[PDB]
Amino acid sequence: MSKPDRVVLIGVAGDSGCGKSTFLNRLADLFGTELMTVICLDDYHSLDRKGRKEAGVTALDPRANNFDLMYEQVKALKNGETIMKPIYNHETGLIDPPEKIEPNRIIVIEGLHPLYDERVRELLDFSVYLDIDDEVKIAWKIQSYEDVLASIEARRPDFKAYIEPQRGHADIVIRVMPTQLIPNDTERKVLRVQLIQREGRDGFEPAYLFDEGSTIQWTPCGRKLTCSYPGIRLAYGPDTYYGHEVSVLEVDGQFENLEEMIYVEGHLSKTDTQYYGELTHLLLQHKDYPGSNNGTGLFQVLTGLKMRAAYERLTSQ
Ligand SMILES: Nc1ncnc2c1ncn2[C@@H]1O[C@H](COP(=O)(O)OP(=O)(O)O)[C@@H](O)[C@H]1O
Ligand SMILES: O=P(O)(O)OC[C@H]1O[C@H](O)[C@H](O)[C@@H](O)[C@@H]1O
């Protein structure tokens, strides 16, 4: 029967090893496993692992995915309709018989091409893109320089042709970069992280520092917070990005204790937390998650808070 329910559709774009499973685990801390259903878009591969090898294409290739079928079932789910979704088996590399997916209050589609097809794009209510510099992405996989570099060098043509342009369509881009606080760094364990927040989505107001419309460089270490060198550095300001207006929040360095975390949170505006300290609580809820001490975990939680705010906004009427 007809319903007043508004199913909210969310997209998470990125390659593997880009913190995507970590990000989805943090979203579970905010929504739970009950009313959120997560769909790995690899299920819409048209070619299985042996098929892609014999056709000579990677999984990044659009000719190895069925966007007609993806759009059919995502649209059906958003109409409160039950679907029979195929299953891609990452172990055996095969496309297994389908399973029954029931519509939920929140549908999150995640994978390589959630923002690639305009038909699916029009269905999404909010989206992220996890952007990892080839420098940082190389450092994560290596933690053999030669063999990894070759691995990411073979995939980059497909990546820049089909994957990277999705950044222009995301409401939020989480960009991970090498640090600027350490001269000639080798390990890439300290990270400079940016939260690129697009202007345009109807109710989505960006988190900011001090003044939402202007540019600030801020070092929180001082008379009220002690840090060891090099410390923490933050930035905020308007900018343009793929021809659209954005608000960029930035953080560089590591949090070495809880006091530095709550100090930064207390000085951020419009984080959409529901109580003072919720950002720090969620960030420390899983100490083992990678990035729990720097800007990657911080901005993942912040992005989820924006999704929660977009969800509560869409389901208020
Ligand atoms: N913020 C981060 N800091 C350091 N390493 C990370 C971070 N996010 C991801 N990684 C590395 O990537 C690997 C896979 O992480 P995961 O979130 O499962 O990526 P995906 O879900 O895209 O496969 C992890 O084992 C970790 O080594
Ligand atoms: O090298 P590719 O064709 O991109 O495949 C990389 C991986 O993609 C898929 O999503 C599965 O995880 C594996 O079946 C495969 O190894």
What is the token pair recorded at 284? 């420390």
Q: Using the 8-state DSSP alphabet, how is residue 222 labeled?
A: B
**Do 46 and 65 form a contact (C-beta atoms < 8 A)?**
yes
Structure-token match 């975390």, residue found: 261
Atom number, ligand 1, closest to the C-alpha of residue 21: 21
Which residues are CB-neighbours of 23 under 8 A, at least 6 positions away?
A: 12, 128, 130, 300, 303, 304
Q: How was this structure determined?
A: X-ray
Residue among 48, 52, 63 to mutate when testing ligand 2 (max atoms within 8 A of CB): 52
Pairing of the two strands 191-198 and 172-178: antiparallel
CA distances from 99 to 47, 87, 153, 157, 217 (A): 18, 7, 36, 34, 51
Structure-token match 């999404």, residue found: 124
- Rounded to whole angstroms, how far apart are CA atoms 270 and 200? 17
What is the token pair recorded at 63? 């000719």
Domain boundaries, the chain: 1-129, 171-309
Which residues are CB-neighbours of 177 under 8 A, at least 6 positions away?
A: 133, 135, 136, 191, 192, 193, 194
The answer to whether domain 1-129 has CATH 3.40.50.300 is yes
Residue 58 Cβ contacting ligand 2 at under 6 Å: yes
- Rounded to whole angstroms, how far apart are CA atoms 298 and 136? 17
**Do 71 and 120 form a contact (C-beta atoms < 8 A)?**
yes
| Residue 213 assigned ligand-binding role | no
Give strand pairing partners of 194. 175, 250
Ligand nearest to the CA of 65: 2
> In terms of Cα–Cα distance, which of 37, 5, 27 is closest to 101?
37
How many angstroms separate the alpha carbon of residue 177 from the centre of ligand 1? 14
Residue 51 Cβ contacting ligand 2 at under 6 Å: no
In angstroms, what is the resolution? Answer: 2.5
CA distances from 30 to 12, 116, 204, 273 (A): 15, 27, 18, 11
Using CB distances shorter than 6 Å, the residues near ligand 1 are 16-22, 140, 290-291, 296
Q: Cis ω on the peptide bond leading into residue 157 (within 30° of 0)?
A: no
Among protein residues, the one with the nearest Cα to ligand 2's atom 13 is: 90
Q: At what angle do helices 20-31 and 295-314 cross, to 10 degrees?
A: 50
> In terms of Cα–Cα distance, which of 80, 62, 73 is closest to 98?
73
Q: Which amino acid is at 126?
A: F
Q: At what angle do helices 145-158 and 134-142 cross, to 10 degrees?
A: 140
- Rounded to whole angstroms, how far apart are CA atoms 191 and 268? 19
